[PDB]
């Protein structure tokens, strides 16, 4: 894309703002008069002086300056705080539409991408738009204006003096080009730095454990430094880019003041335009050189948000998660069935799963047993479809699950484990989350009472006021985890995948786990990656999974008359 | 802290980098004569017109216009190339100083703390200082010089008249002091809120999965607009007081020509000063009125960059881990011996430990085993001294955990767990971390093959100079468990913590970590949190741990017969 087309992609979320550009050119436009009456009405004093003037105007003269300076102190903010509103709007419109897009992205999206990575485009190189929104935009205008007038009157005052504009301004057109393409490859380079320099502190803050036991406090020094120089030179070199642009262009402007200088020390081309057009053309080149320098200068920030707004176009034309299911299932009351299922994780070789024919009746429970990297974690990720399988099919109600939408999809399976997210919200709001507005009070708290969580969440502050979260007022594993099967309760989801514990907690939280999950959880269609011998035995069925086949399937005792897989597992339970 | 307080506390960290500020004085200073002498070899070819000036000169004119040019060019690039050095310097500096002090921390320092907020005060609180450092300074000290020189030659030509300068000062220092106070302020405020902005993306990007089994996109649409609209409020508070300030100053400063003018209005106060002295007095004051204004406009960034170094200065004067043990212990040839350590974690009412009387013999095992929430975990993080109990005191080598260096006291401590941390680098460098430059590659090799880690390593691109990480080629939980096996044969550290699995992988993967384990790892003094019967069975010493003391302790044999705490965990098991 060139600086046009980019922009022109742009444009669209700053027409939503357009007012305040409006409203801070005519601030300006009404600025620059003032500036002007101000300067016809100061020029005789100054040049002329005291002494000269008629005394009645001198005693109204305090009082058009006060009015005068009123005027444009007001003109000023006006236009200050217009063109400061569309910056920070698009800004704001720019970060929320980078948050919406990461929230639409797949579960496998964020295998192959840094938190660092994304935090950085959200803090960052959003950021970076808000020169080219507003201020390089009217500063471009008004230098271009500016421009194109005095050309005009070039060429109105002396023709033939003024060819030397078209011989030069295709070599500072051609200069502009090469740095602006140069502005935007550095503007790329500092965001990927960014980037990494937001990596690299992540990824000592999530290893900092490993730094303290084995040292290596110097190597992660090392480490950080060399990504802070390389962030420091991609500063200098944006710095030297638009440092060497300037003067140069500047040189090739005043080319044309020397070669009118040239011209002019020759009698014969200087009686012919009278002596008195030169004049007037070499003030109209001088005062051509500094709006041409205002522009320069405004190109390397208007580049900056160019650079930043192809790299956020680009991530915003990407490719979300694949919702062409038109199908609304309202309850699961039937079976979730495997069919032939063979699915491979993106990027890896072997199969994580492999001609997996599993059924799940309605209102039954089926126990996944299986060693780690087995595959039953891969089944429950697949039942919610957070990935999709490569062959095979699985049938909710009869139908594909990619025939359903999405979120009706979603809404038909509970997620019970041990790890919980905790939303930064209050403790109502995270058993009743995203649905606040259809559970009431009441609701929630018969629902945490069935869940037997009533007890410690009585016992905080503002009981199920109380704002919790990851960062604040957190929880210890059994807390979470009853939290997690009260909101599973008043969702009253048909199918629930339940990620059992690995580790028992003390005698009284798990006495309530158990009573809440075998009581009041587990009466609908259940699927447990199970992992004590208790609830194996307590299961409608049992699959167990190996290396990514099913090897046996049946009930507690079948299998144990069997005497397979299950049979020496159970035996070394 | 006072404007002046916090600037001479940043100064030291410019003082490395004076040089790039003196060249840029220097280049400004030169750029300043050759515009005068452009200046004067130009007033005439304006004013008076072409025709009157020697038509030799005008021969040699382009001439001097191009080496003009060249000259302003130059001196432009020294002066924006240093001050942006500068700027970059200490902006770096200021990063790594923050990343070494974020370092040092304690472990109970980042339960408190966002990440998210860590990350913005390194990449944007960090920025901020850069506008204070080179450019602000000079700008202020170029403006305050032509402020305190225009100051004089209004005394010298009218010290009567200059009285209202007297006057006016006062109350424009202190409308200055307001907003440069009201700046800190927002910048302080702005700060703060782009570390909610990264905290609220930082939490939906760990619970995406959550969010998309919910729902909830649209509550967190909600919940993040709700931030970017913060930021971009706390944006346009800024932009709002330096708008307000910058006019009333300028207001305030054009008081002094209303005065003039009034007082010209008097043949009596005009036939006295010659009415010659007026109009230089009122020039002066017009000329004056630009720098206050460069002054006021520079204001706004050098407060952002002062609040910025407080935030920063306060936090690298914060409380690192204590370290004031002196003696070195080489390597740990006897017992740890827990002497009546009572632990209570930062924050929380009830003790983790209570009254811990737990001895490790030298060369022996000891499993500890207990429900999750025990204990257990408190005891491995105490030993390698992450907290400090309350009361007690751990005995390594007869003398106590708080007696020796934190670094020679970790270089005696092994932790093996199934979690593993891959540091972003080859995979010799993470066997051989922190001591490269110890062990050689023969060495490395030796340790891996021992580890039983040499086969899948083998089956990678580079075998031992594959790049991994946490971001990039990762590997399964088997794999980084081998590599951490291998990394502590290599360190051959007399102590041993390992934190047991509790899920069994595949059979090849399993039989693995256990021969490495067992033949190569279990031959020191080991403390294992175990999981499996099969462990505890072949360990010397069981301690059982419930609600944070020990209720019962002796051999698997010897627990069996007591028909304590052990008896009924194995019987489950
Ligand atoms: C073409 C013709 C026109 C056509 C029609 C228009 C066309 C379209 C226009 C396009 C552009 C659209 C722009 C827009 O549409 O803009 C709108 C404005 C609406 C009008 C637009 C149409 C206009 C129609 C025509 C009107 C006119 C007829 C709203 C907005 O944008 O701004 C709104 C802001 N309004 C202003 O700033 C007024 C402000 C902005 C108005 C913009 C005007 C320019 C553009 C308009 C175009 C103009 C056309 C002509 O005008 C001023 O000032 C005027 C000052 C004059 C300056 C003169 C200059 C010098 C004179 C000459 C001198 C010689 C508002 O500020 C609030 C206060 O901020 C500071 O106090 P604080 O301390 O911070 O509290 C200021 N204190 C200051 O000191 C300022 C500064 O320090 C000055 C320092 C200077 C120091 C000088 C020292 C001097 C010393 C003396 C010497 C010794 C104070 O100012 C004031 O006092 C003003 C003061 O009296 C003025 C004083 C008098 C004048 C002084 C000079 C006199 C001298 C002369 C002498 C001769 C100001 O009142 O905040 C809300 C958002 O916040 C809220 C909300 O409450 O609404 C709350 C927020 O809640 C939370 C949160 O969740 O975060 C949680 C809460 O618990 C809490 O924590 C809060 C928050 O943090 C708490 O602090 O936050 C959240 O709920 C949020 C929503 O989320 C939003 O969605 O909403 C903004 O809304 P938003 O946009 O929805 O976000
Ligand atoms: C008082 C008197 C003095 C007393 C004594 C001094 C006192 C103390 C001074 C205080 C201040 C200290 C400052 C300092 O101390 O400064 C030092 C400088 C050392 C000298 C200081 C003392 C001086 C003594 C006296 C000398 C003089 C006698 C080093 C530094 O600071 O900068 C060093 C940089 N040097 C410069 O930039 C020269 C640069 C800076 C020098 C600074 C001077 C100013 C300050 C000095 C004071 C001056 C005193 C008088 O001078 C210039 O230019 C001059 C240009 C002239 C401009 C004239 C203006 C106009 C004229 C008038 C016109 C009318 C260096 O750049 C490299 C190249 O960058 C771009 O190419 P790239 O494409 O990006 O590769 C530039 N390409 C450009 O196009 C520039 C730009 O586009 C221009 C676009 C313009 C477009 C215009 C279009 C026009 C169209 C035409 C019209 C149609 C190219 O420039 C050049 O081509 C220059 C070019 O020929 C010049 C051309 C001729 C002139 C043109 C004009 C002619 C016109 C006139 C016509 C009449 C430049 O060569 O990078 C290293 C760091 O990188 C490395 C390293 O290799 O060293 C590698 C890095 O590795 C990695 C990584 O890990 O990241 C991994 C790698 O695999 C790889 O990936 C790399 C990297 O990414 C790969 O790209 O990165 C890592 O290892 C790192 C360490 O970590 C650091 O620790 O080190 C920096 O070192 P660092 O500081 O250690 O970091
Ligand atoms: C002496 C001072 C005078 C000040 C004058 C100030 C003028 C204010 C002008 C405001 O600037 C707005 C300029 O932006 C206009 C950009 O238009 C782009 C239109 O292109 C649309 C192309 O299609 C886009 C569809 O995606
Ligand atoms: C001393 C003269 C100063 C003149 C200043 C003029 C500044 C203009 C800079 C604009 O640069 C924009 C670069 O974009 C390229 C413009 O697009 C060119 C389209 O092609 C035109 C084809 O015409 C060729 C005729 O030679
Ligand atoms: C016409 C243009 C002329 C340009 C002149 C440019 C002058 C360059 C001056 C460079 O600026 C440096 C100013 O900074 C000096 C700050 O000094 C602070 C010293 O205070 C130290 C106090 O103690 C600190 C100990 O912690
Ligand atoms: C129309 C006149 C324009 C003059 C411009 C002057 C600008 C100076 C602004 C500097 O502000 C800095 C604010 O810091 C306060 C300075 O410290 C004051 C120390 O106390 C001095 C005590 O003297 C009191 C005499 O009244």
């Given at each position: 894309l060139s600086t046009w087309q980019t922009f022109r992609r742009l444009w669209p979320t700053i027409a939503p703002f357009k007012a305040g550009l409006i409203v801070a050119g005519v601030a300006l436009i009404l600025n620059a008069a003032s500036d002007t009456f101000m300067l016809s009405l100061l020029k005789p004093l100054l040049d002329?002086?005291?002494?000269?003037?008629?005394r009645s105007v001198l005693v109204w003269m305090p009082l058009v300056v006060i009015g005068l300076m009123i005027l444009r102190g007001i003109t000023s903010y006006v236009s200050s705080y217009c063109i400061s509103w569309v910056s920070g709007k698009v800004v704001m419109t720019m970060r929320r539409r980078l948050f919406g897009h990461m929230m639409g992205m797949p579960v496998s999206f964020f295998d192959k991408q840094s938190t660092g990575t994304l935090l950085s485009r959200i803090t960052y190189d959003s950021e970076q738009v808000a020169s080219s929104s507003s201020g390089a935009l009217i500063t471009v205008v008004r230098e271009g204006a500016s421009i194109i007038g005095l050309f005009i009157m070039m060429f109105y005052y002396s023709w033939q003096l003024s060819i030397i504009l078209i011989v030069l301004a295709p070599i500072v057109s051609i200069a502009i080009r090469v740095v602006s393409k140069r502005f935007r490859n550095i503007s790329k380079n500092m965001q990927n730095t960014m980037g990494q320099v937001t990596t690299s502190a992540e990824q000592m803050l999530k290893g900092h454990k490993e730094v303290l036991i084995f040292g290596g406090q110097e190597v992660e020094t090392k480490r950080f430094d060399k990504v802070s120089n390389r962030m420091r030179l991609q500063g200098m070199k944006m710095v030297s880019a638009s440092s060497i642009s300037d003067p140069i262009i500047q040189l090739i402007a005043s080319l044309a003041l020397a070669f009118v200088l040239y011209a002019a020390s020759f009698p014969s081309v200087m009686d012919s335009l009278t002596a008195g057009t030169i004049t007037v053309v070499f003030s109209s080149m001088i005062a051509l050189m500094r709006p041409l320098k205002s522009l320069t200068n405004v190109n390397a920030q208007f580049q900056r948000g160019m650079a930043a707004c192809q790299t956020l176009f680009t991530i915003l034309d990407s490719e979300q998660e694949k919702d062409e299911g038109k199908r609304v299932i309202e309850r699961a009351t039937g079976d979730v069935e495997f069919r032939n299922v063979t699915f491979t994780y993106p990027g890896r070789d072997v199969p994580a799963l492999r001609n997996i024919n599993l059924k799940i009746p309605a209102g039954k429970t089926v126990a996944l047993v299986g060693r780690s990297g087995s595959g039953k974690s891969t089944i429950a990720s697949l039942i919610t479809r957070f990935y999709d399988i490569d062959e095979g099919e699985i049938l909710m109600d009869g139908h594909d699950l990619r025939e359903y939408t999405l979120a009706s999809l979603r809404n038909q399976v509970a997620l019970v484990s041990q790890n919980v997210h905790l939303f930064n919200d209050t403790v109502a709001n995270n058993i009743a989350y995203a649905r606040t507005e259809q559970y009431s009070r009441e609701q929630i708290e018969e629902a945490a009472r069935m869940a037997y969580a009533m007890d410690f969440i009585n016992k905080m502050d503002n009981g199920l006021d109380t704002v919790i979260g990851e960062n604040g007022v957190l929880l210890s594993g059994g807390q979470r985890q009853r939290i997690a099967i009260a909101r599973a309760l008043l969702r009253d989801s048909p199918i629930l995948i339940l990620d059992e514990a690995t580790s028992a907690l003390d005698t009284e939280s798990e006495r309530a786990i158990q009573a809440a999950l075998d009581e009041?959880?587990?009466?609908?269609?259940s699927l447990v990656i199970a992992h004590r011998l208790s609830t194996i035995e307590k299961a409608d069925e049992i699959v167990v999974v190996e290396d990514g086949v099913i090897v046996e399937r049946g009930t507690h005792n079948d299998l144990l008359e069997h005497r397979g897989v299950y049979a020496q597992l159970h035996k070394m339970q």
């Open positions: 002329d002086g005291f002494g000269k003037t008629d009041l959880q587990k009466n609908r269609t």
